[PDB]
Coordinates of C-alpha atoms in Angstrom, one line a residue:
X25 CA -11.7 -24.8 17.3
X26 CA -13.6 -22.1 17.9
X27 CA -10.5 -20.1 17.4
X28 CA -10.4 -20.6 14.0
X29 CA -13.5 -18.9 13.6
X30 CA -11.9 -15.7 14.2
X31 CA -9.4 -15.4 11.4
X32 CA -12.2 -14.2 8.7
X33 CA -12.8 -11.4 10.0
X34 CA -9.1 -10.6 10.1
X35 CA -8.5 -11.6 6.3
X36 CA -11.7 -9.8 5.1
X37 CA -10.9 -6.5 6.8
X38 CA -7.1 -6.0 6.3
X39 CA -7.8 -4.5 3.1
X40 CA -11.8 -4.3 3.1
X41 CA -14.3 -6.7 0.8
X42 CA -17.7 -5.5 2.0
X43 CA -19.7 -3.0 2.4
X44 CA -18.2 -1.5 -0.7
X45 CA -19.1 2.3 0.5
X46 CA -16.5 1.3 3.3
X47 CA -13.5 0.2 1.1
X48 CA -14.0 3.3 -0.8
X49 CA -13.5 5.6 2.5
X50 CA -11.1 3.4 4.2
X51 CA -8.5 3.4 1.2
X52 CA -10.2 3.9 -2.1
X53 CA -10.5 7.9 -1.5
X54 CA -7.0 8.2 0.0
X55 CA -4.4 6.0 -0.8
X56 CA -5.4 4.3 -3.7
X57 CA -5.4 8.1 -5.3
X58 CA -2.5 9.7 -3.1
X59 CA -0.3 7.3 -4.8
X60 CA -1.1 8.0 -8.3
X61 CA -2.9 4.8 -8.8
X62 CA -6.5 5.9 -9.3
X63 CA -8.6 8.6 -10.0
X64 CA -12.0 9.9 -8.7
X65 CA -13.9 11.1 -12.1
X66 CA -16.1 12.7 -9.7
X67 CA -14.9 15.9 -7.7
X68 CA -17.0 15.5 -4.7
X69 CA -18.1 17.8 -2.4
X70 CA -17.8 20.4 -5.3
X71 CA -14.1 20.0 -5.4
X72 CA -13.4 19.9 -1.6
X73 CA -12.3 16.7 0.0
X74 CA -9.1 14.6 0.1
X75 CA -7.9 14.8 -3.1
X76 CA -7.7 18.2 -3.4
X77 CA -6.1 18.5 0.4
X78 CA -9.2 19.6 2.1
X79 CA -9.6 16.6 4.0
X80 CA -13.0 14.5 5.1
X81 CA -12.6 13.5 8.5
X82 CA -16.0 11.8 8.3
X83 CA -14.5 9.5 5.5
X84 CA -11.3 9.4 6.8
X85 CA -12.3 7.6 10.3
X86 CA -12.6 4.9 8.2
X87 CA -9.1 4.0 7.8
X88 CA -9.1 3.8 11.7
X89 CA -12.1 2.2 12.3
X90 CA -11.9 -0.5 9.7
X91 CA -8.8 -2.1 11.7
X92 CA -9.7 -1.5 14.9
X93 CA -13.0 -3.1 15.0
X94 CA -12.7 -5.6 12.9
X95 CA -9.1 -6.6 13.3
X96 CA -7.5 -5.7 16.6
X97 CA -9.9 -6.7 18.7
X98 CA -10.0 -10.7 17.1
X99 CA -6.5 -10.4 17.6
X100 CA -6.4 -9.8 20.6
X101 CA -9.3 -12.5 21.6
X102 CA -6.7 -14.9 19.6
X103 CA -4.1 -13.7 21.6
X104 CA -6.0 -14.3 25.6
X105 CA -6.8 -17.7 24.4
X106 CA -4.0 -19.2 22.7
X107 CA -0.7 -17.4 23.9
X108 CA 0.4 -20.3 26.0
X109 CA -2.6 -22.9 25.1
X110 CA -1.9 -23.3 21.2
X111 CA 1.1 -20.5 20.0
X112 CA 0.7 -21.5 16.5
X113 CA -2.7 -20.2 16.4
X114 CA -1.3 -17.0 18.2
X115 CA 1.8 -17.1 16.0
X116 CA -0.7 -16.6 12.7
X117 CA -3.1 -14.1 14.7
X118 CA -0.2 -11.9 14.8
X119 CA 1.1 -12.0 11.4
X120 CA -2.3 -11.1 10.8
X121 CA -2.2 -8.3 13.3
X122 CA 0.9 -6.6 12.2
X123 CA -0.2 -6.9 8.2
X124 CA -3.7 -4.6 9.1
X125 CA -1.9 -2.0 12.0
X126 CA 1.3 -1.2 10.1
X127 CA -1.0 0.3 7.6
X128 CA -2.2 2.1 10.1
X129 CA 1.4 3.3 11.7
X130 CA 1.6 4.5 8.1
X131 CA -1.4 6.6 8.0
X132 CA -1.3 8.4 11.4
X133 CA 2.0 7.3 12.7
X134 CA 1.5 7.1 16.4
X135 CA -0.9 4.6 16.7
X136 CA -2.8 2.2 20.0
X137 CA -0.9 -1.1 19.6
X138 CA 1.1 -2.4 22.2
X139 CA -1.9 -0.9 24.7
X140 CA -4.3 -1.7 22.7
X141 CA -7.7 -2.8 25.1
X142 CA -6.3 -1.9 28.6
X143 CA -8.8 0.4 29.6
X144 CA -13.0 1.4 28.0
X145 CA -12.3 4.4 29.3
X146 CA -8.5 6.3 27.4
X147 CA -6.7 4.8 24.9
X148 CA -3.2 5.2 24.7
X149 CA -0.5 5.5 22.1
X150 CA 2.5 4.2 21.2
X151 CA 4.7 6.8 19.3
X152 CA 5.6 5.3 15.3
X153 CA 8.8 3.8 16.1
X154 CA 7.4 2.3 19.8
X155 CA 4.8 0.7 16.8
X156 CA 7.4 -0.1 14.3
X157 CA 9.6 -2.1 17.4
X158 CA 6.9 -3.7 18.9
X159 CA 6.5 -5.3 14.7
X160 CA 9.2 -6.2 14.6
X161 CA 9.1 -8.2 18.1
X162 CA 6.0 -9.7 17.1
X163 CA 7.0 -11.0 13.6
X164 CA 10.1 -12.5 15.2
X165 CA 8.0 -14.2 18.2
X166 CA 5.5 -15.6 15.6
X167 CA 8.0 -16.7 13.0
X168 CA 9.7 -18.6 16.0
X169 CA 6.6 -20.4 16.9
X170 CA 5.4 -21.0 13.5
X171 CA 9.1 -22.6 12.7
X172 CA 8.8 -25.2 15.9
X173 CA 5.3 -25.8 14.6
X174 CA 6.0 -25.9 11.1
X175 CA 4.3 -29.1 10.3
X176 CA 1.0 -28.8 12.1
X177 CA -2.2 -28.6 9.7
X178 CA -3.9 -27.2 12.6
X179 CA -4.5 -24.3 10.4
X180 CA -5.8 -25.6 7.7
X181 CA -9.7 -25.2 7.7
X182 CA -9.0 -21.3 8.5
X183 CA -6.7 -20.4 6.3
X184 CA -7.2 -18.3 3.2
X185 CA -4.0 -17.3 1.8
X186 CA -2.0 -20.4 2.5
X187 CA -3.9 -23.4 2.4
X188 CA -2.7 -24.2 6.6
X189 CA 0.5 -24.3 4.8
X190 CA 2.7 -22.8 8.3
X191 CA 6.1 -22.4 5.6
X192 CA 4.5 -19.8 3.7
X193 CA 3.4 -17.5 6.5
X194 CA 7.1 -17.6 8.0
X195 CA 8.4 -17.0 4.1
X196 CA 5.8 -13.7 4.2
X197 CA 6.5 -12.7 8.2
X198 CA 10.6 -12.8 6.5
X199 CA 8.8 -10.3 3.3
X200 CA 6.8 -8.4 5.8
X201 CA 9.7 -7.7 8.7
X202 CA 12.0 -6.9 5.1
X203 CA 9.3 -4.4 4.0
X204 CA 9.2 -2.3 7.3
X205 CA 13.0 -2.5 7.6
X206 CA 13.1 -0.8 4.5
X207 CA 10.3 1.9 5.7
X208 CA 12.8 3.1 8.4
X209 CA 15.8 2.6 6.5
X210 CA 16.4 6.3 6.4
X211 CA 15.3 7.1 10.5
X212 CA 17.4 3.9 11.9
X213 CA 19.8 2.4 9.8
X214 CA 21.2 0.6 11.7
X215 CA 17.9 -1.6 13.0
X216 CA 16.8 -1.8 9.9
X217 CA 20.0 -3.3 8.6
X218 CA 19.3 -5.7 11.5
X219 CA 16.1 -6.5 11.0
X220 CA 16.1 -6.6 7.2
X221 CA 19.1 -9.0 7.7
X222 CA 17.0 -11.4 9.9
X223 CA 14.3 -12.0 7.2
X224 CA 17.2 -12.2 4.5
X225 CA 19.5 -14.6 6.2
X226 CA 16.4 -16.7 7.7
X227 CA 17.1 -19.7 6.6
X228 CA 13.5 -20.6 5.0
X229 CA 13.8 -16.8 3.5
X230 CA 11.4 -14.5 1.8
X231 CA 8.6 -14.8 -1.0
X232 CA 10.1 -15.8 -4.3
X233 CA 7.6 -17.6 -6.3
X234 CA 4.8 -16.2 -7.3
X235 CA 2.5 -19.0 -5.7
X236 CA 4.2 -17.6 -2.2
X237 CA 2.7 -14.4 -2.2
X238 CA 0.2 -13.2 0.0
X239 CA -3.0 -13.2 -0.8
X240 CA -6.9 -13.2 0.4
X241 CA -8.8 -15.8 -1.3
X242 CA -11.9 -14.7 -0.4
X243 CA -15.3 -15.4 -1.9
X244 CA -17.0 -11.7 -1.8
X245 CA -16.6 -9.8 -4.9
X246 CA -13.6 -7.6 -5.3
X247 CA -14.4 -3.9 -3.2
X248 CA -13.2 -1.8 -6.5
X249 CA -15.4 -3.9 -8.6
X250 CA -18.7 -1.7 -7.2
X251 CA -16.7 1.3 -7.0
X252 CA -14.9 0.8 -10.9
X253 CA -17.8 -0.7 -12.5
X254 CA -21.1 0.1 -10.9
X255 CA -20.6 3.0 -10.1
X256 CA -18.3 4.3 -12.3
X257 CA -16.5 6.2 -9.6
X258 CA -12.7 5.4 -9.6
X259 CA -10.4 5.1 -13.0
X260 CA -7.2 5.4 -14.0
X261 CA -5.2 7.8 -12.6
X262 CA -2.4 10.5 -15.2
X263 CA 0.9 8.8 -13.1
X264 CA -0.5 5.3 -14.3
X265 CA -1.2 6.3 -18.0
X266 CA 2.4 8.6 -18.1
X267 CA 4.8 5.7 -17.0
X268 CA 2.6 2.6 -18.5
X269 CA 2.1 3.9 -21.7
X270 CA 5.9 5.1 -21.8
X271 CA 7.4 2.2 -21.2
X272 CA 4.6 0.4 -23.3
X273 CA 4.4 -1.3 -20.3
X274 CA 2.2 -4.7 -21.5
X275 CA 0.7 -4.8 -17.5
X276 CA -1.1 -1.9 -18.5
X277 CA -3.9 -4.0 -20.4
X278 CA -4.0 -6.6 -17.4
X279 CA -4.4 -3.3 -15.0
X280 CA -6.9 -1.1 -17.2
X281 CA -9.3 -1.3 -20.3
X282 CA -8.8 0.8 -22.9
X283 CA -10.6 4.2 -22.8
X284 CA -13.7 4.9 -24.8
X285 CA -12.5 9.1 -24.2
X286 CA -9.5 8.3 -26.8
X287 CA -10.3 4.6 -28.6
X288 CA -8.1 1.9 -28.0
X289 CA -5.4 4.0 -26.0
X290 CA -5.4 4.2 -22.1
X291 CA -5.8 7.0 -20.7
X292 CA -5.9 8.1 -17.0
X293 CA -7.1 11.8 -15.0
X294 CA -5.2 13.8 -13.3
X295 CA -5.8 13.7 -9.5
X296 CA -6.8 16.4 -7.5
X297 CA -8.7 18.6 -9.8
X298 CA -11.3 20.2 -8.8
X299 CA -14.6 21.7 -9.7
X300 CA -13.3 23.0 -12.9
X301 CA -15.1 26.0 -13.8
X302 CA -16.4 24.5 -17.3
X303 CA -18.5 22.3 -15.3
X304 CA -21.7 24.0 -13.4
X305 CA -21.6 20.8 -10.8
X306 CA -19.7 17.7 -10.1
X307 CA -22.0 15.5 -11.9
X308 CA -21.4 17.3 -15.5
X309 CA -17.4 16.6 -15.0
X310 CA -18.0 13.5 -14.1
X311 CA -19.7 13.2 -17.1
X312 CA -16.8 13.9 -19.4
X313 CA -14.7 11.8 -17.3
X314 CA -15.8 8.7 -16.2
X315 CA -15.0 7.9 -20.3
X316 CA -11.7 7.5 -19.1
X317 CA -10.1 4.1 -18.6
X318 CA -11.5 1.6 -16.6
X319 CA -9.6 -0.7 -14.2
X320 CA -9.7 -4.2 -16.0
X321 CA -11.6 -7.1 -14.5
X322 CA -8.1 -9.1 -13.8
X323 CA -6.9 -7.2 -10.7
X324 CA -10.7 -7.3 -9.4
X325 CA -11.2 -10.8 -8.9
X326 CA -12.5 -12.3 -5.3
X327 CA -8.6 -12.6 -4.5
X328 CA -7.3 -9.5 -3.1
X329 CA -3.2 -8.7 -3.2
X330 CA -2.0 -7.7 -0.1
X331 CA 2.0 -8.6 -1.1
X332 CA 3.4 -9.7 -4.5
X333 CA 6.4 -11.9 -4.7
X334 CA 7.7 -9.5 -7.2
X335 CA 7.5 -6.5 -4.5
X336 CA 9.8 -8.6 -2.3
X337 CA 12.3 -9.1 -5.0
X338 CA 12.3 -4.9 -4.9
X339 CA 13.1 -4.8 -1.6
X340 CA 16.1 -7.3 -1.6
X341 CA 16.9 -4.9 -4.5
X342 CA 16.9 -1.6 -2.4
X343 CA 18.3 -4.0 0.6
X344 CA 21.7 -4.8 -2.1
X345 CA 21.8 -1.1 -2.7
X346 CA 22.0 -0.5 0.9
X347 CA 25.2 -3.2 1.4
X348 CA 22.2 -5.4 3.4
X349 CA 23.9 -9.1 3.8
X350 CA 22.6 -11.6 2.0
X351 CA 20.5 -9.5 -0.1
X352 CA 22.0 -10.6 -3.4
X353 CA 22.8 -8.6 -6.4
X354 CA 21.1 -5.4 -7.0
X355 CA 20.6 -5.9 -10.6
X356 CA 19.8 -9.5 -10.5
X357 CA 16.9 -8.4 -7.8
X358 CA 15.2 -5.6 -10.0
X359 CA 15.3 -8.0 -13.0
X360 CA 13.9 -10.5 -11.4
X361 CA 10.9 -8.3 -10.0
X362 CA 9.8 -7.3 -13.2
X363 CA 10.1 -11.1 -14.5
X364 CA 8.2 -12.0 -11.3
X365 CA 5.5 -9.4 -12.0
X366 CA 5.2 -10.1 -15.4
X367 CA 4.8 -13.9 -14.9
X368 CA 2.0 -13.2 -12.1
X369 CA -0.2 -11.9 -15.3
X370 CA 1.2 -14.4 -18.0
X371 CA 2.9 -11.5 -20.2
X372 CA 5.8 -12.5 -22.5
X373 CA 8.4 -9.9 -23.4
X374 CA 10.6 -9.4 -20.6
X375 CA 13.4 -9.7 -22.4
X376 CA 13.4 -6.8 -24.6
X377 CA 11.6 -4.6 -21.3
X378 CA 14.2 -5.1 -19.6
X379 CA 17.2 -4.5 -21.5
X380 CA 14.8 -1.4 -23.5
X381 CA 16.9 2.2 -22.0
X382 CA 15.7 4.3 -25.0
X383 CA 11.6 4.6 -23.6
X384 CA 10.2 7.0 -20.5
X385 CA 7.1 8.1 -19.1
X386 CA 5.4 10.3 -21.7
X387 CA 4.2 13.3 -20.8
X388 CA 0.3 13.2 -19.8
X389 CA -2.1 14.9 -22.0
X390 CA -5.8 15.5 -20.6
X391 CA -8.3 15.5 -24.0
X392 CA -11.5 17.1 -22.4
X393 CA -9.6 19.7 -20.4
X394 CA -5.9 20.9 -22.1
X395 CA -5.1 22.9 -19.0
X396 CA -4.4 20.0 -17.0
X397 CA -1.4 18.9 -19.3
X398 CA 2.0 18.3 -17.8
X399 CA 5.3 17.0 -18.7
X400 CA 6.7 13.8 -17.5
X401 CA 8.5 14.6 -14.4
X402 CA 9.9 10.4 -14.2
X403 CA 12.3 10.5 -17.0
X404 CA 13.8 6.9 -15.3
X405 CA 14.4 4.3 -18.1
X406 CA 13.8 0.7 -17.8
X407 CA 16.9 -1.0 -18.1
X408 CA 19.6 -1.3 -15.1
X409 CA 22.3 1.5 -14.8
X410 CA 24.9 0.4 -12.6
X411 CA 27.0 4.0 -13.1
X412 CA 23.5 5.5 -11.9
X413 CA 23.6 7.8 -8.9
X414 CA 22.3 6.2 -5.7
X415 CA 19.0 8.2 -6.3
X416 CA 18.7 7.2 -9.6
X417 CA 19.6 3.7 -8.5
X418 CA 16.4 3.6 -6.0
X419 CA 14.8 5.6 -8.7
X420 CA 14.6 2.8 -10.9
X421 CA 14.1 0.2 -8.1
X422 CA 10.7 1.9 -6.4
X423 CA 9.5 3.3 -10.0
X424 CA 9.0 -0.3 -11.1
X425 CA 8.0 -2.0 -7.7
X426 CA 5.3 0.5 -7.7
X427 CA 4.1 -0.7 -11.5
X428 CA 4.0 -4.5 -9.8
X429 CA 2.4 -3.2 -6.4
X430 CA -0.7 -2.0 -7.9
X431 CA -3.8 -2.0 -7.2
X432 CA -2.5 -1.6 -3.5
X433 CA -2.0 2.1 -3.0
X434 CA -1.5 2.0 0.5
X435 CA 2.4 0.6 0.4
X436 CA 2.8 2.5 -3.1
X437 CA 1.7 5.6 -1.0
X438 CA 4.0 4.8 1.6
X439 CA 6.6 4.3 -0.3
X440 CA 5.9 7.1 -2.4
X441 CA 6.2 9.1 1.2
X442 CA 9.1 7.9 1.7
X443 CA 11.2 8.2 -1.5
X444 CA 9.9 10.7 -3.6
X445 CA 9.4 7.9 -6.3
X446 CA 8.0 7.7 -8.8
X447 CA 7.6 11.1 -9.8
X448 CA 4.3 11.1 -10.1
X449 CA 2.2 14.0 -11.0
X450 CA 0.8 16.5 -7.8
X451 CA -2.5 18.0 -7.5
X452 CA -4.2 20.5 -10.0
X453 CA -5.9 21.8 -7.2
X454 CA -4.4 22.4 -3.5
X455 CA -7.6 23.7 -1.4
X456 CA -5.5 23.1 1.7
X457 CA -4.6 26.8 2.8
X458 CA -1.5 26.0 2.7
X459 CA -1.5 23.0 5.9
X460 CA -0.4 20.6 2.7
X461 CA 2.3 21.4 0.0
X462 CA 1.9 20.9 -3.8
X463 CA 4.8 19.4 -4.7
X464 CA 6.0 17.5 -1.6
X465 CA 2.1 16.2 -1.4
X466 CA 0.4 15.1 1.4
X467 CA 2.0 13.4 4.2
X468 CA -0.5 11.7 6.9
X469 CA -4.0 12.0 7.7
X470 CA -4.6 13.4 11.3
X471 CA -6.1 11.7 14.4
X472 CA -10.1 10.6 13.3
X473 CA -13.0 12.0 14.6
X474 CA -14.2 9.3 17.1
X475 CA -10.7 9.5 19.0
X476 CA -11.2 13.5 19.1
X477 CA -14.7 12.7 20.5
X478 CA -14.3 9.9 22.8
X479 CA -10.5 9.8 23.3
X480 CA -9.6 12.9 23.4
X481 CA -6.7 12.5 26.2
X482 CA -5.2 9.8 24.4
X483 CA -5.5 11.9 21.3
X484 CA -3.8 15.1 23.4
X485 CA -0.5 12.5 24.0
X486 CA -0.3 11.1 20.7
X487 CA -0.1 14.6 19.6
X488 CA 3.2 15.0 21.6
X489 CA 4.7 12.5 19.8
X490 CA 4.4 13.9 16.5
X491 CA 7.0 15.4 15.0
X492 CA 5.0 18.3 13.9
X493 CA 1.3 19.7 14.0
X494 CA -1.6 17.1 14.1
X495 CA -1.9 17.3 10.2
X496 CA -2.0 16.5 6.8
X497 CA 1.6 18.1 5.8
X498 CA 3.2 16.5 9.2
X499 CA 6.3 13.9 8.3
X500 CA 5.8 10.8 9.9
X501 CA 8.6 9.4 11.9
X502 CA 10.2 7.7 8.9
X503 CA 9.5 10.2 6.8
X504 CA 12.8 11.9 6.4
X505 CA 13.3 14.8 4.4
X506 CA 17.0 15.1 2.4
X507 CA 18.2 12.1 0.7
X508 CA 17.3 8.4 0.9
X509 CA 20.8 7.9 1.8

C-alpha cells in the first residue's frame, strides 16, 4: 500500500530521531530540562534562554513545527484515503496522531486539531479541552476499529512498535486515553473518571508487560546520543542526582555514567544557572561542567520510549487513589511499577527498595560552584504508606513514575505541571522579569513565531482561550492551582 508508506514519518517525528540540532530545540532544551531530567552544561546565549525563563522563540517553534509538518499533515493524508476504504489503517494513523498532538496540547494548550488543514490561508484553534475531547473521541473511534479488525496483518510491513500486532496498539490507545484522563483529573472529574474507566474496564485492558510498551524501533541513532556524547551538551540534571542517589536508586547506573567531576559517584547540575560570574563566557563554564555525569548508552539506543508499561501501572495507581473502577489496588499498582521498571533494565533488588522507608532524596551538592547548594525539598520515602495524606499518597505515586518515565521529559514535565511532584529543585537563575515564577516554575511556552507571522488571526483567537496572558507563567487548562484533590 502506498499508505503504509506514510507511518515513518509519523514514528520518527513523534519524539524526533534526526537532524539532531532539531531534537535538541524541539524537546531537548525545554522539557527534557523543565522536568529536572537533564541539564545544559552550557548557559547559552550568555545565560539568557529557556532555562533560565527568558525564552527562545526561535528554538521554541520547534516543538510546533516538528508535529505539524511532519506528523499532522500524514495523518491527515491517512485519514482522506482510508476513513471508509481501509479503517484499520485510519484506526493506527490516529493513535499515531493523538500520541504526537497531545504533547502539543501540553505545551501551548490551545492547539489546531480538530480544524487542522481547512484553509492555506488562517488556522484555527481548538481551546485545550475542545483538544483533550476530540482525544478522547479519536482513541475510542480507533480502538473500536482496531478491535473488529483485530486479526488483520495488514499492518505488518509498517509497523515499528508492534510488529502489525493490532492487540497491542488497542492495549496502548486503553494506556494512552488512561494517561490523559489523569491529566484533567483535577479540571473534569467526572470525564475523566469516565474515560479513565473505559481504558480500565476494556476488556483487552492497558500495558502490563513490559514487551507491551510503546516503543519506536527505529534504525537512526538515538537524538541525545549527538547531543550527550558528541557534543557534550546535555547531562544529568541536580533533581536526578538528589532522588537517585537517595534512594540508591540501582536505575541510576542504567540512566547515567558515573561522573569524572567526583569519581565513581553521579552527579548532576543544577538547571537554570546562568552565566555565573566566575566564568568570563559560556564556554569556560561549560568547561567545569560538562565533567559532570553523562547519560549512559542504555537509554540511547536506536529504540526511543515513548510509554513504559511501568508508567501505566502509575496511573492505575493514581486512578485507585481516585476510587477509579477497576483500577485495582493502590499499593499493589505502585509496587508493581517499580518491579515493572526495574525489570525493563534487568535490575535485581526490588524487594528490599520497595519495602526500604528509612532513605530520601539527599540534598544536592554542586562541587565546582558551592553557591548553588540546596536541601532536598522531596523528603518522600520509598515504601507504601497507606495512613499517608492524599498528597503524600500521589507524592509517592508520581515521584517514582517520574524515576521510570525517564528520558521522556515531556510527560515528566507535564506531570510535574500538574502535581507539583517530585519536588524537584527550581532555577538558580529566573531572568524572566517576573512573566515566570521561581518556585511554581514555568508553565507553557507561548504561541511560536511562524503562527505570529503567518497566522496571526488564528493566533489573536487562541489567545482568547487562554486562561491567562499569552505566556510562559500562564496555567494551562488542566493546570489547576490548590490541591490535586
Amino acid at each position: 500500500q502506498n499508505v503504509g508508506s506514510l507511518y515513518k514519518p509519523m514514528f520518527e517525528n513523534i519524539y524526533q530521531y534526526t537532524p539532531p540540532w532539531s531534537y535538541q530545540l524541539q524537546q531537548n532544551l525545554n522539557a527534557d530540562v523543565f522536568s529536572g531530567y537533564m541539564t545544559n552544561p552550557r548557559p547559552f546565549v550568555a545565560g539568557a534562554n529557556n532555562t533560565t525563563y527568558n525564552l527562545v522563540s526561535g528554538w521554541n517553534n520547534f516543538i510546533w513545527s516538528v508535529p505539524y509538518s511532519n506528523v499532522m499533515n500524514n495523518a491527515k493524508t491517512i485519514e482522506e484515503e482510508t476513513k471508509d476504504e481501509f479503517p484499520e489503517l485510519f484506526a493506527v494513523s490516529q493513535i499515531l496522531k493523538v500520541t504526537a498532538m497531545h504533547r502539543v496540547a501540553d505545551v501551548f494548550g490551545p492547539i489546531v486539531y480538530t480544524k487542522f488543514g481547512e484553509s492555506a490561508t488562517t488556522s484555527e484553534y481548538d481551546s485545550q479541552e475542545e483538544a483533550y475531547n476530540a482525544f478522547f473521541n479519536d482513541l475510542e473511534e480507533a480502538i473500536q476499529i482496531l478491535s473488529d479488525n483485530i486479526d488483520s496483518p495488514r499492518f505488518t510491513a509498517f509497523d515499528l512498535a508492534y510488529g502489525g500486532n493490532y492487540t497491542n496498539w488497542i492495549k496502548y490507545a486503553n494506556s494512552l486515553r488512561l494517561r490523559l484522563a489523569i491529566r484533567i483529573s483535577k479540571v473534569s472529574p467526572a470525564k475523566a473518571k469516565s474515560e479513565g474507566e473505559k481504558s480500565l474496564n476494556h476488556s483487552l485492558g492497558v500495558i502490563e508487560t513490559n514487551p507491551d510498551g510503546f516503543f519506536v524501533n527505529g534504525t537512526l541513532d538515538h537524538p541525545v546520543r549527538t547531543i550527550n556524547n558528541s557534543w557534550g551538551d546535555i547531562r544529568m540534571n541536580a533533581s536526578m542526582e538528589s532522588i537517585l542517589v537517595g534512594y540508591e536508586d540501582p536505575r541510576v547506573d542504567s540512566y547515567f555514567n558515573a561522573s569524572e567531576v567526583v569519581e565513581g559517584e553521579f552527579k548532576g547540575i543544577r538547571n537554570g544557572l546562568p552565566l555565573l560570574s566566575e566564568y568570563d563566557d559560556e564556554l569556560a563554564q561549560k568547561a567545569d561542567y560538562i565533567t559532570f555525569s553523562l547519560l549512559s548508552d542504555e537509554v540511547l539506543t536506536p529504540r526511543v520510549q515513548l510509554m513504559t508499561a511501568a508508567e501505566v501501572f502509575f496511573l492505575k495507581a493514581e486512578a485507585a487513589l481516585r476510587g477509579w473502577s477497576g483500577a485495582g489496588d493502590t499499593r499493589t499498582n505502585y509496587e508493581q511499577g517499580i518491579t515493572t521498571s526495574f525489570q525493563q533494565y534487568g535490575l535485581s533488588g526490588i524487594s528490599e527498595y520497595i519495602a526500604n522507608n528509612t532513605r530520601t532524596p539527599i540534598d544536592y551538592v554542586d562541587p565546582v560552584t558551592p553557591a548553588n547548594n540546596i536541601n532536598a525539598l522531596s523528603t518522600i520515602t520509598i515504601e507504601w504508606d497507606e495512613a499517608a495524606s492524599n498528597e503524600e499518597k500521589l507524592e509517592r505515586i508520581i515521584t517514582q513514575k517520574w524515576i521510570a518515565l525517564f528520558p521522556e521529559g515531556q510527560e515528566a514535565w507535564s506531570e510535574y505541571r500538574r502535581t507539583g511532584y517530585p519536588k524537584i529543585f527550581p532555577v538558580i537563575s529566573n531572568q524572566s522579569g517576573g512573566v515566570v515564577d521561581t518556585d511554581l516554575q514555568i508553565r507553557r511556552i507561548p504561541f511560536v513565531d511562524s503562527e505570529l507571522q503567518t497566522n496571526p488571526d488564528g493566533v489573536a483567537d487562541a489567545i482568547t482561550k487562554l486562561g491567562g496572558p499569552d505566556n510562559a507563567g500562564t496555567r494551562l487548562w488542566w493546570d489547576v492551582p490548590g490541591g490535586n484533590f
